[PDB]
Design a protein around this ligand. Structure first.
Ligand code: HEM
Ligand SMILES: O=C(O)c1ccc(-c2ccccn2)cc1
Ligand SMILES: [Cl-]
Length: 393
């Protein structure tokens, strides 16, 4: 009943420009079968949203990558939050929700905004910069490791580890296997920083360990929960900030609207998350035979969701391929949906907002002035290089 397609959503051709193939996947039907990897695929908003919001049928404890943890061993010990289902997911999720809570954002907002303003001031002195290395990468590295409580030495492992984590959700292709081959020093660094004595007082890591007193998590659970904040959040936020700068460079009318009302900075970043979804794909595993979109999927089957495709589905969005900083973005799935919806979303929005605010107030024009290079990852979408000239306001 369901169409079989040979599209490889983990190929370099797909990474380079996924949007035509995503229309083909959406228009083939609500549920497709991807013969290249023997998985089901859903690329329309409706089915992506339905899958994310039924965690009992479409579980996460068998992995959110291609690998089925019932059949293969995970490349690293499973995440206590991402790779767990309710009820095991519930208490670790609550701890991270309180560590990264609305109240916590007040304690870090002033410092995050100051670092964003300072970075833009510094970049304006150079004029011609790389908006990835010098901005989208440099800014999160200047605020988040400190907010975690990490020491200075060894931070060069953070970007490789994040890219490794998201490559490892993919199939065993060259991108994944080469990342795992070089992973040992990054794993060793990350696992060591998760121990309580290595996390500075007042930071996110120390706060996680402090929750072991409440009954929500035990002391032996805290290192892995800290590991979550050294796995997720870096590359996605980098890619989101880079995408926002890319969009403001490509859509100068939107930069002009943002300059005229810098309070649109938060929604300008949210629209960038919808428009160039930093996380493009990941999986669920069926725990039973299930009818989805008129299709019957058997038990123990991997289901690949196309988050970026759902965020550009014309069945759900008006003018989905336009970047609109006043768009009503509520409902996009760039942060997921349901019980696993990004627990770090307040940190990401804070970083994105204060950076776009600094650009809105200090920059008059953003002009691409060099070759734009794409960064390739099995599940992340982002730029490798974005040469731009910043004109001061
Ligand atoms: C633009 C930036 C970000 C994007 C696009 C993003 C995307 C996502 C998505 C789609 C999920 C759902 C995964 C699933 O349903 O299986 C998720 C979960 C998660 N995110 Fe993010 N994220 C971002 C920033 C962050 C930050 C800054 C942090 C940490 C400070 C973080 C930590 C996490 C964690 C721990 C989870 C697992 C939540 C759970 O399983 O309950 N993320 N993220
Ligand atoms: O708990 C962790 O280590 C972890 C949590 C979440 C992610 C993630 C996965 C897919 C999309 C967005 N985020 C990765 C790792
Ligand atoms: Cl690890």
């Amino acid at each position: 009943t369901i169409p079989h397609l040979a599209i490889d959503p983990f190929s370099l051709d797909f990474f380079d420009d996924p949007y035509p193939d995503q229309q083909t996947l959406r228009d083939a039907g609500p549920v497709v079968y991807l013969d290249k990897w023997n998985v089901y695929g859903v690329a329309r908003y409706a089915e992506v949203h339905a899958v994310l919001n039924d965690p009992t049928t479409f579980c996460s404890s068998r992995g959110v990558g291609l690998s089925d943890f019932k059949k293969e061993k995970p490349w690293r010990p499973p995440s206590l939050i991402l790779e767990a289902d309710p009820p095991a997911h519930t208490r670790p999720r609550a701890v991270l929700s309180k560590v990264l809570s609305p109240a916590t954002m007040k304690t870090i907002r002033d410092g995050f905004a100051a670092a964003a303003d300072a970075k833009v001031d510094e970049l304006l002195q150079r004029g011609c910069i790389d908006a990835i290395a010098d901005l989208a990468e440099a800014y999160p590295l200047s605020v988040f490791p400190d907010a975690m409580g990490l020491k200075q030495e060894g931070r060069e492992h953070l970007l490789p580890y994040a890219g490794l984590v998201f490559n490892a959700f993919g199939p065993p292709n060259e991108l994944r296997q080469t990342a795992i081959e070089r992973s040992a020093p990054h794993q060793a660094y990350v696992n060591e920083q998760c121990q309580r004595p290595n996390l500075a007082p007042g930071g996110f890591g120390a706060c996680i360990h402090a929750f072991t007193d409440t009954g929500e998590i035990t002391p032996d659970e805290a290192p892995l929960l800290v590991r979550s904040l050294l796995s997720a959040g870096l590359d996605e936020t980098v890619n989101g900030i880079g995408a926002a700068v890319y969009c403001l460079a490509r859509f100068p009318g939107e930069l002009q609207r943002l300059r005229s009302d810098p309070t649109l900075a938060r929604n300008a970043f949210e629209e960038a998350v919808r428009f160039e979804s930093p996380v493009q794909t990941f999986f669920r595993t069926t725990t039973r035979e299930v009818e989805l979109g008129g299709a019957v999927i058997g038990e123990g089957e991997k289901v690949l969701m196309f988050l970026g495709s759902a965020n550009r589905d014309p069945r759900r969005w008006s003018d989905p391929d336009l970047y609109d900083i006043t768009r009503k973005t509520s409902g996009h799935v760039g942060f997921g949906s349901g019980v696993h919806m990004c627990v770090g979303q307040l940190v990401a929005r804070l970083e994105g907002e204060v950076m776009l605010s600094a650009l809105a107030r200090k920059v008059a024009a953003i002009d691409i002035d060099g070759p734009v290079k794409r960064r390739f990852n099995n599940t992340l979408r982002g730029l490798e290089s974005l040469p731009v000239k910043l004109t001061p306001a």
